[PDB]
Amino acid sequence: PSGVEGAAFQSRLPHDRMTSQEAACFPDIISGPQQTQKVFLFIRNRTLQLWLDNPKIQLTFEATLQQLEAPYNSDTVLVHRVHSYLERHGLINFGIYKRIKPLPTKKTGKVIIIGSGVSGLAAARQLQSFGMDVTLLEARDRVGGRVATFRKGNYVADLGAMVVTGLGGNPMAVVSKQVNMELAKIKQKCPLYEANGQAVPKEKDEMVEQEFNRLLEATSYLSHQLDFNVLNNKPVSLGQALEVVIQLQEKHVKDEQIEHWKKIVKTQEELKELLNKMVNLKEKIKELHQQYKEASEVKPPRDITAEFLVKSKHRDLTALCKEYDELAETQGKLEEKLQELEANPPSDVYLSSRDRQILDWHFANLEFANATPLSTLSLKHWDQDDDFEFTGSHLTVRNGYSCVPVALAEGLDIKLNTAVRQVRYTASGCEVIAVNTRSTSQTFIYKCDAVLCTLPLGVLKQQPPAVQFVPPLPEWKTSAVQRMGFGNLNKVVLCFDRVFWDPSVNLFGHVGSTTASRGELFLFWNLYKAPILLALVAGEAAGIMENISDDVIVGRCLAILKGIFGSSAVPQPKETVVSRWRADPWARGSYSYVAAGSSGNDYDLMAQPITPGPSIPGAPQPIPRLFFAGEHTIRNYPATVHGALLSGLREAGRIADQFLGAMYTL
Amino acid sequence: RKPPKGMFLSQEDVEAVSANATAATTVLRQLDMELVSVKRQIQNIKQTNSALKEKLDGGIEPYRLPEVIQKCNARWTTEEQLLAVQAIRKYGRDFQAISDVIGNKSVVQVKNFFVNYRRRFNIDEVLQEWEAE
Numbered sequence: 001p002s003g004v005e006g007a008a009f010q011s012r013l014p015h016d017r018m019t020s021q022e023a024a025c026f027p028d029i030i031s032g033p034q035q036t037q038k039v040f041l042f043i044r045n046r047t048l049q050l051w052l053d054n055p056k057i058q059l060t061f062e063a064t065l066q067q068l069e070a071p072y073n074s075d076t077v078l079v080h081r082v083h084s085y086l087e088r089h090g091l092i093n094f095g096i097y098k099r100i101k102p103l104p105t106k107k108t109g110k111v112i113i114i115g116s117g118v119s120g121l122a123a124a125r126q127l128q129s130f131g132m133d134v135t136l137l138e139a140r141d142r143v144g145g146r147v148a149t150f151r152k153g154n155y156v157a158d159l160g161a162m163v164v165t166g167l168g169g170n171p172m173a174v175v176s177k178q179v180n181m182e183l184a185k186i187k188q189k190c191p192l193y194e195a196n197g198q199a200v201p202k203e204k205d206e207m208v209e210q211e212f213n214r215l216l217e218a219t220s221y222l223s224h225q226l227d228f229n230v231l232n233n234k235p236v237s238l239g240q241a242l243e244v245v246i247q248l249q250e251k252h253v254k255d256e257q258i259e260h261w262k263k264i265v266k267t268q269e270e271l272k273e274l275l276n277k278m279v280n281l282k283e284k285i286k287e288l289h290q291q292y293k294e295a296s297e298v299k300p301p302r303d304i305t306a307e308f309l310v311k312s313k314h315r316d317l318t319a320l321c322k323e324y325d326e327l328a329e330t331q332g333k334l335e336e337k338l339q340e341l342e343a344n345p346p347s348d349v350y351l352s353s354r355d356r357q358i359l360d361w362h363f364a365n366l367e368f369a370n371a372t373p374l375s376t377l378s379l380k381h382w383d384q385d386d387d388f389e390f391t392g393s394h395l396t397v398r399n400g401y402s403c404v405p406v407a408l409a410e411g412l413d414i415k416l417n418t419a420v421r422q423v424r425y426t427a428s429g430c431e432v433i434a435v436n437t438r439s440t441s442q443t444f445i446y447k448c449d450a451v452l453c454t455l456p457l458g459v460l461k462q463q464p465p466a467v468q469f470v471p472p473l474p475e476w477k478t479s480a481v482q483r484m485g486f487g488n489l490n491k492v493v494l495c496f497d498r499v500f501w502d503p504s505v506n507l508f509g510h511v512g513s514t515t516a517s518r519g520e521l522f523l524f525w526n527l528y529k530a531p532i533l534l535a536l537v538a539g540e541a542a543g544i545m546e547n548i549s550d551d552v553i554v555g556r557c558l559a560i561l562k563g564i565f566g567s568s569a570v571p572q573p574k575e576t577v578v579s580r581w582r583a584d585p586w587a588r589g590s591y592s593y594v595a596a597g598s599s600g601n602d603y604d605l606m607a608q609p610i611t612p613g614p615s616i617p618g619a620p621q622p623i624p625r626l627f628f629a630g631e632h633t634i635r636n637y638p639a640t641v642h643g644a645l646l647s648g649l650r651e652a653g654r655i656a657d658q659f660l661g662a663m664y665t666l
Numbered sequence: 667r668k669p670p671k672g673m674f675l676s677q678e679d680v681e682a683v684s685a686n687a688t689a690a691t692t693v694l695r696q697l698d699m700e701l702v703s704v705k706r707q708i709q710n711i712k713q714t715n716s717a718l719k720e721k722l723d724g725g726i727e728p729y730r731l732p733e734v735i736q737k738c739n740a741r742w743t744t745e746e747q748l749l750a751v752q753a754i755r756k757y758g759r760d761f762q763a764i765s766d767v768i769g770n771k772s773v774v775q776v777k778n779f780f781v782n783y784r785r786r787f788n789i790d791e792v793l794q795e796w797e798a799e
């Protein structure tokens with residue numbers, strides 16, 4: 001898409017329809033005449049286009065109205081309402097842009113933001129842009145959170161987020177124009193290598209993959225068409241379903257064989273009855289020939305009865321010889337029909353041991369993408385965010401993803417090494433109690449109008465809690481926390497002095513020995529300028545490999561690489577790092593997933609702000625005080641950077657509406 | 667609406683393989699034994715048929731009679747009439763058999779014989795004695 005309609009697409013909005021959010025801010029327009037709606041939509045789309053065409057400078061209302069045409073620039077309040085709406089909700093003027101109107105001299109309201117991840121930083125910038133007092137409290141000695149980047153010398157490798165998942169409708173596309181991001185496309189082709197150290201032939205490397213894709217569609221069929229979603233009260237997982245589908249495919253293989261050999265016995269038993277009839281006929285022919293012979297020995301002249309006997313037995317013999325020939329005819333038909341069926345048997349097995357291992361790599365890859373064992377994923381909902389996937393090739397940040405949070409962090413009040421311990425929220429306001437991570441006895445108190453919590457779902461899950469809420473979070477919030485899945489995947493950074501792999505190959509697989517260890521070092525990335533190989537630990541392996549020292553992990557890495565490229569072509573690594581995301585106290589995992597028993601609705605529950613009870617009983621309904629952003633709060637883009645970014649933008653808009661008032665809704 | 671191609675999943679089958687913890691292994695074993703059962707049943711009847719084939723060795727070659735090639739005649743020799751009466755006694759209404767016994771009379775001439783020499787050869791009585799066996 002291109003033009004004004006492309007700008008709507010690039011902003012994840014339908015170009016020819018008003019969204020639910022737009023309906024709320026402009027109820028006059030959407031409930032009004034169709035012509036006004038189209039004027040609204042064009043104004044919206046055009047303003048978006050203007051911002052998108054140049055996202056390095058602020059787009060003011062004046063600049064917007066200037067470039068609008070008649071009859072669209074006639075209603076200046078409608079233009080002002082639209083622009084304000086778009087600025088408030090972070091569709092325009094978000095990220096890092098040059099301000100035309102320097103920030104308001106004095107600020108209004110005070111917000112404490114827990115965590116300076118991308119979600120935290122995104123909101124912080126917005127709120128500051130709206131003229132609020134903003135302070136971020138980070139536990140780490142750095143910004144970015146789960147955007148971690150290893151740097152040493154020239155070696156640059158991301159231990160956290162690494163991939164921009166397509167620019168088509170990605171807010172990171174806008175950010176990438178604002179920040180010096182060296183975006184390099186990922187070449188799709190990934191050659192697998194079995195345990196032995198040798199490539200899987202394109203023959204099998206397609207039979208298995210196609211079967212893998214077929215097995216997924218099959219689970220989808222199981223879910224939607226057969227309603228196989230609850231088993232023994234427990235919700236069915238993707239793993240359970242995949243197992244069931246495989247078993248039914250092994251069943252069919254056997255069912256085929258059974259009825260094929262059942263075809264053989266039926267024909268072989270027809271032959272048995274025919275051969276019996278033939279043996280019994282050759283018996284009568286044997287006897288009947290003897291009788292005719294004896295009748296012919298009686299030399300002429302003979303009376304008519306004796307002449308008749310000869311003739312009669314002659315007739316009877318050729319008659320029985322007629323039958324036997326027609327039975328030998330049928331014998332030939334049945335005898336070749338048996339060589340027919342025995343020539344083409346059905347499939348011997350569904351999948352061999354070699355096949356099942358290559359399939360396990362495909363399962364591991366899926367376990368990597370969702371950062372969790374397939375037995376934890378919801379069958380019905382694991383892929384609920386598929387419809388919102390971006391268009392275009394996936395890219396990597398070649399200069400390290402940390403460049404993004406660091407760039408967002410500029411000009412913001414960030415307290416590093418500050419671990420939030422308690423969040424207190426009341427009708428009159430909030431206090432956040434944090435400590436210094438270096439000396440834990442040194443205590444800090446932060447008084448604010450509102451708290452934006454961007455704690456990871458892993459953190460929020462902690463038992464006993466790392467952060468206490470006063471009063472406690474309501475049952476509907478904590479149940480969402482327990483239900484939601486928070487998974488895990490790890491990275492091994494291998495820095496060498498020389499490239500010993502195929503430089504035109506970005507990623508290559510390693511097929512594990514067992515189902516149990518399919519995740520273990522199953523994939524390797526070659527993405528960076530410098531000679532770095534990145535090894536992935538997925539599935540059930542991720543959690544276990546964290547209890548193993550770096551040396552052993554690097555050991556197994558070299559072993560695998562030796563098998564593939566040669567035992568002498570693989571030198572010792574100069575620098576190595578191993579991530580441990582489940583162990584990390586400021587993460588307690590990698591990112592959320594739709595657990596069995598959860599749904600996309602839990603993500604909405606997570607995003608819901610908390611409103612304290614009244615101080616004095618009988619006092620009016622208080623303002624909401626505690627707001628939630630972060631990866632685990634955005635239903636349509638969970639477990640991503642752009643999702644985090646967007647959830648930040650969301651909350652900043654909601655908070656500003658609450659504490660600065662929405663002037664654009666009139 | 668329908669499963670993927672080369673994929674087999676019926677409501678009935680799903681319920682059967684998910685009935686308990688190892689209903690999967692049970693169903694797959696019952697068919698594993700069913701296959702072995704039918705496989706050895708094949709070799710058994712294969713062995714039986716192999717023996718029956720050997721007893722048929724040589725075919726019916728030393729028992730075939732050369733082809734009698736004679737032209738069809740209209741006149742009835744006393745001989746042929748007498749053959750006919752005996753052929754009726756042994757075969758009844760099988761006009762094809764009777765024709766083959768006599769040798770030089772067509773199937774229709776045989777049927778004609780039945781009406782022409784009906785009273786003179788008491789064919790009614792001859793036929794009723796054929797039915798008596």
Ligand SMILES: CC(=N)C[C@@H](c1ccccc1)[C@]12Nc3cc(C)c(C)cc3N(C[C@H](O)[C@H](O)[C@H](O)COP(=O)(O)OP(=O)(O)OC[C@H]3O[C@@H](n4cnc5c(N)ncnc54)[C@H](O)[C@@H]3O)C1=NC(=O)NC2=O
Nearest residue numbers: 115117118119139145146162163420586630631640641644
């Ligand atoms: C669909 C995907 N899975 C995307 C990824 C991907 C995978 C495979 C193929 C392609 C892409 C993908 N890869 C990828 C790999 C790995 C290894 C991991 C880990 C994650 C990602 N993801 C997910 C994203 O990384 C992930 O969604 C966002 O970055 C999350 O952003 P926040 O929501 O803001 O959360 P946070 O950053 O934790 O900020 C919170 C802060 O609070 C602090 N704090 C804590 N406690 C505190 C206390 N007491 N007191 C005070 N402070 C406290 C704490 O220290 C921290 O700083 C990727 N996202 C992508 O977009 N692309 C990627 O490639």
